[PDB]
Design an enzyme around this catalytic site. Structure first.
Site, short mmCIF file in Angstrom:
data_model
loop_
_atom_site.label_atom_id
_atom_site.label_comp_id
_atom_site.label_asym_id
_atom_site.label_seq_id
_atom_site.Cartn_x
_atom_site.Cartn_y
_atom_site.Cartn_z
N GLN A 123 -15.48 23.76 9.19
CA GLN A 123 -16.08 24.34 7.99
C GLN A 123 -16.43 25.80 8.23
OE1 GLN A 123 -18.30 21.77 5.11
NE2 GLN A 123 -20.05 23.16 5.58
N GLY A 136 -3.02 44.34 4.93
CA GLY A 136 -1.60 44.63 5.02
C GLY A 136 -1.43 45.90 5.86
N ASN A 145 -2.96 49.54 5.22
CA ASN A 145 -4.09 49.87 6.11
C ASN A 145 -3.85 51.28 6.69
OD1 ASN A 145 -5.37 47.32 5.87
ND2 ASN A 145 -4.43 46.54 7.81
N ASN A 205 1.91 46.36 20.31
CA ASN A 205 0.81 45.71 20.98
C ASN A 205 1.32 45.35 22.35
OD1 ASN A 205 -1.53 45.08 19.74
ND2 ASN A 205 -0.95 42.99 19.15
N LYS A 238 -3.07 48.35 24.44
CA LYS A 238 -3.61 47.24 25.20
C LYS A 238 -5.08 47.05 24.88
CE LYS A 238 -3.30 50.46 29.13
NZ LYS A 238 -3.37 50.66 30.61
N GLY A 239 -5.40 47.10 23.58
CA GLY A 239 -6.72 46.72 23.10
C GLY A 239 -7.81 47.49 23.81
N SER A 240 -8.80 46.77 24.32
CA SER A 240 -9.94 47.36 25.02
C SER A 240 -9.60 48.07 26.35
CB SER A 240 -11.06 46.33 25.22
OG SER A 240 -10.75 45.38 26.23
N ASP A 256 -3.55 49.17 13.31
CA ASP A 256 -3.10 50.07 12.26
C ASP A 256 -3.86 51.40 12.21
OD1 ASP A 256 -1.19 48.15 11.59
OD2 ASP A 256 -2.57 47.14 10.23
N1 ANP Z 1 -13.14 46.76 21.19
C1 ANP Z 1 -12.64 48.00 21.00
N2 ANP Z 1 -13.41 49.12 20.97
C2 ANP Z 1 -12.92 50.37 20.76
N3 ANP Z 1 -11.60 50.60 20.55
C3 ANP Z 1 -10.70 49.45 20.57
C4 ANP Z 1 -11.18 48.10 20.78
N4 ANP Z 1 -10.12 47.27 20.72
C5 ANP Z 1 -9.06 48.10 20.48
N5 ANP Z 1 -9.39 49.42 20.38
C6 ANP Z 1 -8.50 50.58 20.16
O1 ANP Z 1 -7.46 50.26 19.24
C7 ANP Z 1 -6.19 50.20 19.90
C8 ANP Z 1 -5.30 49.09 19.41
O2 ANP Z 1 -5.71 47.86 19.97
P1 ANP Z 1 -4.60 46.70 19.80
O3 ANP Z 1 -3.63 46.77 21.07
O4 ANP Z 1 -3.78 47.03 18.48
O5 ANP Z 1 -5.41 45.32 19.61
P2 ANP Z 1 -4.70 44.11 18.75
O6 ANP Z 1 -4.54 42.84 19.70
O7 ANP Z 1 -3.27 44.47 18.11
N6 ANP Z 1 -5.58 43.65 17.32
P3 ANP Z 1 -4.79 42.41 16.37
O8 ANP Z 1 -3.21 42.59 16.36
O9 ANP Z 1 -5.28 42.45 14.85
O10 ANP Z 1 -5.14 41.02 17.06
C9 ANP Z 1 -6.43 50.32 21.40
O11 ANP Z 1 -5.46 50.99 22.17
C10 ANP Z 1 -7.87 50.76 21.54
O12 ANP Z 1 -7.84 52.18 21.67
N1 ADN Z 2 -14.73 18.60 5.35
C1 ADN Z 2 -14.86 18.45 4.01
N2 ADN Z 2 -16.09 18.29 3.45
C2 ADN Z 2 -16.28 18.13 2.12
N3 ADN Z 2 -15.26 18.11 1.24
C3 ADN Z 2 -13.91 18.27 1.73
C4 ADN Z 2 -13.65 18.44 3.15
N4 ADN Z 2 -12.32 18.56 3.27
C5 ADN Z 2 -11.81 18.45 1.99
N5 ADN Z 2 -12.77 18.27 1.05
C6 ADN Z 2 -12.55 18.14 -0.43
O1 ADN Z 2 -12.86 16.86 -0.97
C7 ADN Z 2 -11.76 16.26 -1.66
C8 ADN Z 2 -11.52 14.85 -1.11
O2 ADN Z 2 -12.56 14.45 -0.21
C9 ADN Z 2 -10.57 17.22 -1.54
O3 ADN Z 2 -10.01 17.60 -2.81
C10 ADN Z 2 -11.10 18.42 -0.76
O4 ADN Z 2 -11.08 19.60 -1.53
N1 ADN Z 3 2.19 37.47 10.15
C1 ADN Z 3 1.88 38.62 9.58
N2 ADN Z 3 2.83 39.41 9.02
C2 ADN Z 3 2.55 40.61 8.46
N3 ADN Z 3 1.29 41.07 8.41
C3 ADN Z 3 0.23 40.27 8.93
C4 ADN Z 3 0.46 39.00 9.57
N4 ADN Z 3 -0.74 38.54 9.95
C5 ADN Z 3 -1.67 39.48 9.59
N5 ADN Z 3 -1.07 40.51 8.95
C6 ADN Z 3 -1.65 41.73 8.44
O1 ADN Z 3 -1.74 42.73 9.46
C7 ADN Z 3 -2.94 43.48 9.31
C8 ADN Z 3 -3.48 44.02 10.64
O2 ADN Z 3 -2.42 44.80 11.21
C9 ADN Z 3 -3.84 42.75 8.29
O3 ADN Z 3 -4.42 43.57 7.27
C10 ADN Z 3 -2.99 41.61 7.71
O4 ADN Z 3 -2.72 41.72 6.32
MG MG Z 4 -0.39 45.66 14.82
#
Ligand code: ANP
Ligand code: ADN
Ligand code: ADN
Ligand code: MG
Ligand code: ANP
Ligand code: MG
Ligand code: MG
Ligand code: MG
Lengths: 298, 299
Positions: free
Chosen positions: B31, B41, B45, B184, B213-215, B245
């Site tokens: 939940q 997107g 973004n 990434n 590479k994120g952090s 992005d």
């Molecule tokens: N916790 C952080 N604090 C500050 N800058 C960050 C942090 N994480 C990422 N960045 C900056 O943003 C850049 C991009 O991180 P990124 O490699 O794109 O993470 P990511 O795994 O793609 N996120 P997502 O694809 O949505 O799960 C890095 O090179 C960092 O400079």
């Molecule tokens: N964990 C949950 N707790 C309460 N209601 C739910 C849960 N999962 C699904 N439901 C909703 O209740 C209905 C059947 O129990 C479904 O249409 C669904 O939307």
């Molecule tokens: N499988 C996917 N394909 C394309 N865009 C995605 C996917 N999952 C998340 N995103 C988007 O990528 C963004 C972060 O780069 C989010 O705003 C989200 O809309």
């Molecule tokens: Mg990306």
């Protein structure tokens, strides 16, 4: 409580089904064309089935700011279901289930509580209906409903998937204000263990305990008798979900229409047999005449 | 292509973003107390972050029947982002993402393609921008864009979360028409396994390979050198989602503003440090002055 009318209390919820090949491993993404939307929630499933069977119904649910001129609101208005008791959140979306299902049919469900946060600031109205049916939702609010309605309106209670949330104390207390208690077998097994109850203990408290067993039928227990209800054959099983709510719809509609408990169970069984014939909990709900016709052959 | 402007090609989407302690296992329910949709997107973004940094941007995406005259459209228009090239579907919904972040800021996503089915019916326009940045989306349409733009406009390419859709052959061909390639750490690994490529293979085809590479920061590889870019501290990390992005937005904005590759990377990193301070990919996008002020506090 006087009018040919049932109140359903509890979740009105959007269900979205996402069919995937495989669930994403950590740090990956999957892409899918679309998700199919279904009108769900246990209270609204029951209310819509009751209305389809020719019995007026009203809904008391917390809905969100997306409910709200969108698909669900208009669909209910179109079916003439009374939604004057809905609470409309400005802060949260309508409760919904996002259901992701893989190719081997394993499932992961995310349920959004959302607008259901509002029940704890609400208190139930006086109900003017023959039956107040309490489905999944907020247990504390649901207890308030049962305590307010009992001895005035007939109370029907079906804790469902909320069961684990009830303390022994609280489950006892709601059952003491319940006339019809519905549970599937797993639910009944769960509650009985909690409460240290056998069938006779329930019947000291309620007028009828109904235990549903899907394809093996159901049984109605009263102070007086045990009534075995057969499963009624469907045309072809696609989605076995929603059988639950629609059995309740049939049973309660038949009771308000003045039939005895056996026939209420039969109508319940025959209503559910239509619901399993399509995907979605509300998509293949039958009319009264169609229910009576299907029961007439088997 | 000569306008001090960047074209962003790829998804515009509405995002749900969730924090979980651990990702749910098969056959299990969770939940969520509360959820909200965010403007998202990758292409949108980036286009929004670019504009916020004071560089004109235009967006090319396929949007749904929930777009013409909705909140997202009015928001982009208010931003003076050129959205004149968008494709509005008559029957598909705008793409949507469900993004889950665990306690170690790993993420998984589920992405509904919706209106992006239309890309197969479309062809790119001529581009008159200095840079065309391709940020996720449809492989075949993206390859058309890169082939269209290459040797005229600078092509930046970030296949992102949609990488699994690329065959080896198509991914290779787009890279051969790419100036700046961003991935990434995860994407770079998969891409390199698919292509059987080492760093130098990429560098035979592209001008700069940027691997984040994120952090741990990021690295820019050119034919000449390896430039290491630090992670720039944020103030309280709330949501890592927009980091990727907004890094491209910072890097490419700085490039158009005429700064060298190292400074572009430093600006990308400081831009991302602001975005991760709030949930939503576009919520805390910073101005150029704020980003620069933060950068000089580093070094
Ligand atoms: N916790 C952080 N604090 C500050 N800058 C960050 C942090 N994480 C990422 N960045 C900056 O943003 C850049 C991009 O991180 P990124 O490699 O794109 O993470 P990511 O795994 O793609 N996120 P997502 O694809 O949505 O799960 C890095 O090179 C960092 O400079
Ligand atoms: N964990 C949950 N707790 C309460 N209601 C739910 C849960 N999962 C699904 N439901 C909703 O209740 C209905 C059947 O129990 C479904 O249409 C669904 O939307
Ligand atoms: N499988 C996917 N394909 C394309 N865009 C995605 C996917 N999952 C998340 N995103 C988007 O990528 C963004 C972060 O780069 C989010 O705003 C989200 O809309
Ligand atoms: Mg990306
Ligand atoms: N396959 C079936 N064919 C015909 N009738 C069925 C079938 N499954 C259930 N029913 C009828 O519908 C009633 C409800 O089934 P039930 O035991 O409540 O399902 P459940 O365990 O609650 N699953 P769900 O409906 O998804 O919540 C039963 O008493 C049956 O008479
Ligand atoms: Mg009593
Ligand atoms: Mg049930
Ligand atoms: Mg070359």
């Amino acid at each position: 409580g006087k009018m040919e009318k049932i109140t359903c209390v509890g979740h009105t919820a959007l269900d979205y089904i996402f069919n995937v090949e495989k669930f994403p491993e950590p740090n990956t993404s999957i892409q899918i064309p679309s998700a199919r939307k279904y009108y769900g929630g246990a209270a609204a499933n029951t209310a819509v089935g009751i209305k389809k069977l020719g019995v007026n119904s009203e809904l008391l649910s917390c809905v969100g700011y997306d409910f709200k001129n969108s698909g669900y609101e208009r669909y209910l208005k179109n079916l003439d279901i009374n939604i004057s008791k809905l609470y409309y959140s400005e802060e949260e979306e309508t409760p919904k289930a996002w259901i992701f299902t893989d190719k081997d049919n394993n499932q992961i469900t995310f349920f959004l509580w959302g607008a259901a946060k509002h029940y704890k600031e609400l208190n139930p109205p006086n109900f003017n209906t023959e039956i107040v049916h309490i489905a999944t939702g907020d247990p504390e609010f649901n207890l308030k409903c049962a305590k307010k309605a009992y001895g005035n309106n007939l109370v029907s209670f079906d804790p469902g998937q909320d069961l684990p949330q009830y303390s022994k104390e609280m489950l006892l207390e709601i059952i003491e204000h319940t006339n019809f208690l519905f549970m599937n077998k797993h639910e009944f097994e769960r509650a009985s263990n909690l409460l240290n109850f056998e069938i006779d203990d329930y019947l000291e408290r309620v007028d009828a305990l109904i235990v549903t067993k899907g394809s093996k039928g159901s049984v109605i227990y009263t102070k007086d008798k045990k009534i075995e209800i057969p499963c009624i054959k469907a045309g072809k099983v696609i989605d076995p979900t929603g059988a639950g709510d629609s059995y309740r719809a049939g049973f309660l509609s038949a009771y308000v229409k003045g039939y005895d408990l056996e026939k209420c169970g039969l109508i319940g069984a025959a209503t559910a047999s239509f619901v399993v014939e399509a995907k979605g909990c509300q998509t293949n709900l039958p009319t009264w005449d169609k229910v009576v016709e299907r029961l007439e052959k088997h």
